[PDB]
Amino acid sequence: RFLKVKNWETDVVLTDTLHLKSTLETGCTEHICMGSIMLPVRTKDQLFPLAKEFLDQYYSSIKRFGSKAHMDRLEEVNKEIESTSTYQLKDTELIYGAKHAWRNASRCVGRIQWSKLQVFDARDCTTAHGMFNYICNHVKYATNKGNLRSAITIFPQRTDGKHDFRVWNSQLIRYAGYKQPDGSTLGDPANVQFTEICIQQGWKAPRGRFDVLPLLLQANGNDPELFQIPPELVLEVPIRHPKFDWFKDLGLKWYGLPAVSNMLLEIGGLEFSACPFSGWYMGTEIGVRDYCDNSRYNILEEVAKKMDLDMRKTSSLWKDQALVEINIAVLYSFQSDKVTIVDHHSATESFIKHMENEYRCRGGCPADWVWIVPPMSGSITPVFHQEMLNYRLTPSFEYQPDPWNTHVW
Amino acid sequence: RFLKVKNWETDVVLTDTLHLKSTLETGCTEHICMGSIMLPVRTKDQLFPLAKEFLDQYYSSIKRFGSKAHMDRLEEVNKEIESTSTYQLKDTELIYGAKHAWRNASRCVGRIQWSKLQVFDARDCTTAHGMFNYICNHVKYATNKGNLRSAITIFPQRTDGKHDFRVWNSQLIRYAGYKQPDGSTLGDPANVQFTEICIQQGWKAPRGRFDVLPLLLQANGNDPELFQIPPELVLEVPIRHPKFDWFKDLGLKWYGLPAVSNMLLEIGGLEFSACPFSGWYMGTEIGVRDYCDNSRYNILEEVAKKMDLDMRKTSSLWKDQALVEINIAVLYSFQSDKVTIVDHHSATESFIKHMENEYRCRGGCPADWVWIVPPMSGSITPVFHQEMLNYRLTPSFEYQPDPWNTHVWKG
Ligand code: HEM
Ligand code: HEM
Numbered sequence: 001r002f003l004k005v006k007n008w009e010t011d012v013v014l015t016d017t018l019h020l021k022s023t024l025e026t027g028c029t030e031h032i033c034m035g036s037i038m039l040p041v042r043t044k045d046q047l048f049p050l051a052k053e054f055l056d057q058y059y060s061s062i063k064r065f066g067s068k069a070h071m072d073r074l075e076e077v078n079k080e081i082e083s084t085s086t087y088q089l090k091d092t093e094l095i096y097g098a099k100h101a102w103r104n105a106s107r108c109v110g111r112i113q114w115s116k117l118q119v120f121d122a123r124d125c126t127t128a129h130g131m132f133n134y135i136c137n138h139v140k141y142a143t144n145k146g147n148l149r150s151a152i153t154i155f156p157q158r159t160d161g162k163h164d165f166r167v168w169n170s171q172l173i174r175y176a177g178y179k180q181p182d183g184s185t186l187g188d189p190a191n192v193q194f195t196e197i198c199i200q201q202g203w204k205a206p207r208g209r210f211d212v213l214p215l216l217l218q219a220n221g222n223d224p225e226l227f228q229i230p231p232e233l234v235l236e237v238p239i240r241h242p243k244f245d246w247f248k249d250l251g252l253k254w255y256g257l258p259a260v261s262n263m264l265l266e267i268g269g270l271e272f273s274a275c276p277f278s279g280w281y282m283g284t285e286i287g288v289r290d291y292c293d294n295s296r297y298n299i300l301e302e303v304a305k306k307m308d309l310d311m312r313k314t315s316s317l318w319k320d321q322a323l324v325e326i327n328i329a330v331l332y333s334f335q336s337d338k339v340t341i342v343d344h345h346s347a348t349e350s351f352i353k354h355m356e357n358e359y360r361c362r363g364g365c366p367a368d369w370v371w372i373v374p375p376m377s378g379s380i381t382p383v384f385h386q387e388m389l390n391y392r393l394t395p396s397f398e399y400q401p402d403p404w405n406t407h408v409w
Numbered sequence: 410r411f412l413k414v415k416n417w418e419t420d421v422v423l424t425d426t427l428h429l430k431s432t433l434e435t436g437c438t439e440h441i442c443m444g445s446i447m448l449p450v451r452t453k454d455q456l457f458p459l460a461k462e463f464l465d466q467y468y469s470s471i472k473r474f475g476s477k478a479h480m481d482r483l484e485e486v487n488k489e490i491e492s493t494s495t496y497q498l499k500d501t502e503l504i505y506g507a508k509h510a511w512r513n514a515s516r517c518v519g520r521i522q523w524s525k526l527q528v529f530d531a532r533d534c535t536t537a538h539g540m541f542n543y544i545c546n547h548v549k550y551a552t553n554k555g556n557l558r559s560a561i562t563i564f565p566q567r568t569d570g571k572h573d574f575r576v577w578n579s580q581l582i583r584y585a586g587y588k589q590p591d592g593s594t595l596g597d598p599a600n601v602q603f604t605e606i607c608i609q610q611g612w613k614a615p616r617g618r619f620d621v622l623p624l625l626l627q628a629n630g631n632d633p634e635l636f637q638i639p640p641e642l643v644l645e646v647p648i649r650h651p652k653f654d655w656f657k658d659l660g661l662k663w664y665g666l667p668a669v670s671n672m673l674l675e676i677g678g679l680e681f682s683a684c685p686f687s688g689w690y691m692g693t694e695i696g697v698r699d700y701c702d703n704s705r706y707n708i709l710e711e712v713a714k715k716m717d718l719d720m721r722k723t724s725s726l727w728k729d730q731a732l733v734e735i736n737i738a739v740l741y742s743f744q745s746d747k748v749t750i751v752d753h754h755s756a757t758e759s760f761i762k763h764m765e766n767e768y769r770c771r772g773g774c775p776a777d778w779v780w781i782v783p784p785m786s787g788s789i790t791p792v793f794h795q796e797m798l799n800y801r802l803t804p805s806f807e808y809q810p811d812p813w814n815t816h817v818w819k820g
């Protein structure tokens with residue numbers, strides 16, 4: 001019932017009690033571990049337990065548990081659900097809920113930052129043009145001229161499930177991908193399907209390698225609509241290397257603002273299906289994953305060639321050498337252009353400190369080791385040596401089906 | 410039931426049915442995943458089912474399930490258990506068992522090789538001197554002048570748990586570690602406690618940075634005895650770098666033969682508490698873990714110093730740079746001396762081919778992602794992108810308590 005986690009580098013042992021407050025299921029059983037699997041409406045009856053659980057933790061958090069104001073709010077929400085089949089969160093609850101969904105995100109190494117989140121309440125939004133406005137304002141606020149600030153914008157909650165708000169983009173800012181007669185892929189291969197949806201809905205694709213995609217926004221269950229984000233709001237960084245003068249000629253760039261927009265925020269049983277949120281990048285996300293995944297920009301081969309490495313045999317570690325250089329360049333470029341970025345050493349060191357705070361202050365910290373350990377140089381980061389327990393707490397961010405599969409036109 | 414795994418790089422989807430044969434528990438529940446936890450006397454009653462399950466598996470593998478020989482062997486083992494409380498494996502069953510424990514080892518990336526395992530049957534062994542002789546022969550056979558061959562030596566099984574055979578070394582070949590009065594460590598800090606035991610038992614320590622430890626061997630529940638492996642049997646590689654000529658002057662070397670000696674082999678309910686096994690290295694085990702863990706040789710700083718990397722900010726990626734150079738050095742050095750080694754790209758690519766094969770022919774391949782993914786350059790290896798299912802099959806290799814924690818000293 002009480003669980004221990006050990007760090008094998010430092011011998012520090014922490015005791016987890018927070019897992020006993022775990023609501024949702026993991027995918028694992030006593031017979032099988034699904035730890036490495038990527039992906040493993042509410043009737044009146046289901047909603048009240050969920051609301052009570054949430055309000056209890058909320059009132060506890062402001063040191064008012066069992067107070068008249070606590071009991072009063074529980075009755076008010078109970079009455080509202082009994083009458084309307086749903087309920088509305090107070091601003092204070094919504095903010096607490098959003099901060100806690102981030103605090104609970106077991107796959108996020110950046111959670112030391114969880115209490116500094118700007119929450120933009122977009123529950124009064126009714127159209128896609130309204131959504132576009134809210135999103136530009138979020139983009140501009142979060143970007144802050146390179147001095148990035150964490151933010152989330154929360155559109156109206158699901159009702160009967162036929163009037164869903166959705167941002168169809170997987171992130172607010174991404175690059176288009178196009179299949180060519182050639183048989184190869186121009187731009188980002190991850191976005192080929194989405195790019196085609198944009199085209200089939202009207203978008204004039206410039207057909208380049210780094211074309212910022214249009215937002216495709218769905219309000220109130222309606223057909224989604226296209227908008228170009230003002231370019232002056234999309235802060236991009238040209239990638240150069242501090243030692244290699246040829247690096248700029250690869251013609252690489254990335255965007256400054258990582259902003260996930262396809263997830264669902266669950267607070268007190270309510271479901272916010274459009275809740276784009278953003279922070280700032282850890283360097284490896286771009287340099288290792290975006291640039292080097294075989295199925296992404298896949299640039300290792302071109303870079304290795306320019307370095308004049310021996311690509312005859314895997315054992316020369318030519319991939320590993322090129323990988324480090326690409327990642328030095330990402331960090332140097334962002335740092336030179338004064339755009340907030342964190343390297344994997346710094347971010348994992350901060351996460352270990354955050355785990356210790358959470359264990360000391362909350363009795364635990366759900367973490368998914370498979371996600372938390374950076375995709376390069378794993379064991380030279382402290383997280384590699386840290387046992388982590390993974391479990392699901394609410395409020396939470398959850399995955400949801402891509403809208404093009406669900407939506408009826 | 411069927412469980413699917415997806416490779417996110419290739420979109421190849423595989424279907425597991427083999428998990429239906431898993432008996433042991435994982436540590437996980439519906440409410441918690443213990444996937445990153447390092448470590449998550451049998452009665453007759455519990456023994457016959459375990460024997461039967463094993464012999465059914467063996468007899469199926471040789472295409473003799475339900476034969477007279479299968480039935481006679483069940484009857485014979487049954488009778489042996491009831492009368493003597495245990496039983497003895499036939500040589501053939503021991504071989505099959507040890508190969509399968511390797512095939513089932515979900516933390517092992519090298520399992521493409523599982524069917525090529527030399528099994529040395531050391532069940533007639535009775536003394537520590539006998540164990541020493543068996544282990545020297547294993548070392549010489551496995552080493553094979555650098556052309557490494559996988560092998561395992563299997564000492565007598567547990568009886569009442571008061572008469573255990575144990576190799577106290579965690580690996581047959583490892584370097585001493587010595588804690589100095591000033592709190593620094595000479596040699597391998599992983600081996601400090603074990604080094605202290607060896608010293609106390611009477612080992613004369615040379616006190617250098619790469620002193621091969623003596624074997625500390627326990628037979629039949631007796632107090633363990635020290636033995637020095639003949640140095641001519643301990644193949645070592647001096648580490649140098651193909652471009653950096655100062656690399657040699659770091660004074661680094663490593664041994665060629667990775668040989669785990671502290672695990673317990675379970676076959677058909679029987680427990681082999683001393684079963685040292687060996688293969689060949691994947692470079693990262695030495696270049697990443699042994700050399701660069703903060704709690705091991707910890708050479709990153711000195712290497713990066715000598716490379717004149719910018720060390721004042723982690724964001725220069727100096728550690729990552731020095732890490733790649735060290736790992737190039739390890740593979741170059743082994744290759745130059747003709748000692749078998751595999752790089753992490755080759756080994757993971759082979760593992761994925763092994764895993765796909767296993768899914769087709771066996772219905773699955775239990776794998777622990779946390780261990781299988783290499784400790785550098787994770788996502789440029791194909792295993793990073795491969796979903797894996799982890800479950801426990803027998804025969805198996807298991808952890809067991811360090812023997813200095815449990816041994817009853819006879820004096
Ligand atoms: C402030 C700087 C932040 C850093 C450095 C950071 C770091 C990261 C990284 C490296 C990942 C893994 C992404 C991947 O590999 O696909 C991630 C995932 C995630 N983060 Fe953060 N994060 C930050 C801010 C935030 C914020 C502001 C939120 C929510 C308000 C958030 C919630 C999440 C969630 C829910 C995931 C899992 C996403 C998924 O499953 O695809 N993070 N974080
Ligand atoms: C032949 C070449 C082999 C290679 C390249 C290889 C590779 C590896 C590696 C890299 C590990 C992880 C070690 C660590 O990080 O501590 C490992 C673990 C393991 N291997 Fe292998 N292996 C080989 C042969 C063998 C053999 C012959 C056996 C037994 C017959 C074996 C059984 C195991 C077991 C039980 C583990 C888990 C060890 C633990 O939990 O500490 N492997 N293998």
Ligand SMILES: Cc1cc(N)nc(C[C@H]2CNC[C@H]2OCCNCc2ccccc2F)c1
Nearest residue numbers: 038171258259260277278279280281282285
């Ligand atoms: C808020 C935030 C900050 C930060 N530094 N990084 C992120 C993650 C963003 C930026 N880089 C990857 C992207 O994550 C979204 C996709 N998450 C991984 C994923 C999940 C399901 C399916 C596919 C897939 F790639 C989000």
Ligand SMILES: Cc1cc(N)nc(C[C@H]2CNC[C@H]2OCCNCc2ccccc2F)c1
Nearest residue numbers: 447519667668669686687688689690691694
């Ligand atoms: C047979 C074999 C081949 C091969 N290439 N590698 C190995 C593993 C050996 C050599 N390198 C590390 C060592 O692993 C032994 C123990 N594994 C780590 C471990 C397990 C439990 C607890 C702590 C701990 F560090 C074994």
Ligand SMILES: C[C@H](O)[C@H](O)[C@H]1CNc2nc(N)[nH]c(=O)c2N1
Nearest residue numbers: 036037038370371793794795796
């Ligand atoms: C199959 C495996 O779970 C998958 O490749 C994971 C591994 N770890 C990851 N870790 C992070 N941070 N992001 C990812 O996309 C992944 N992908």
Ligand SMILES: C[C@H](O)[C@H](O)[C@H]1CNc2nc(N)[nH]c(=O)c2N1
Nearest residue numbers: 384385386387445446447779780
């Ligand atoms: C806490 C964590 O499980 C631990 O550090 C693991 C991670 N993955 C590993 N993987 C391998 N191959 N060997 C190891 O020792 C470890 N250590």
Ligand SMILES: [Zn+2]
Nearest residue numbers: 028033437442
């Ligand atoms: Zn699990």
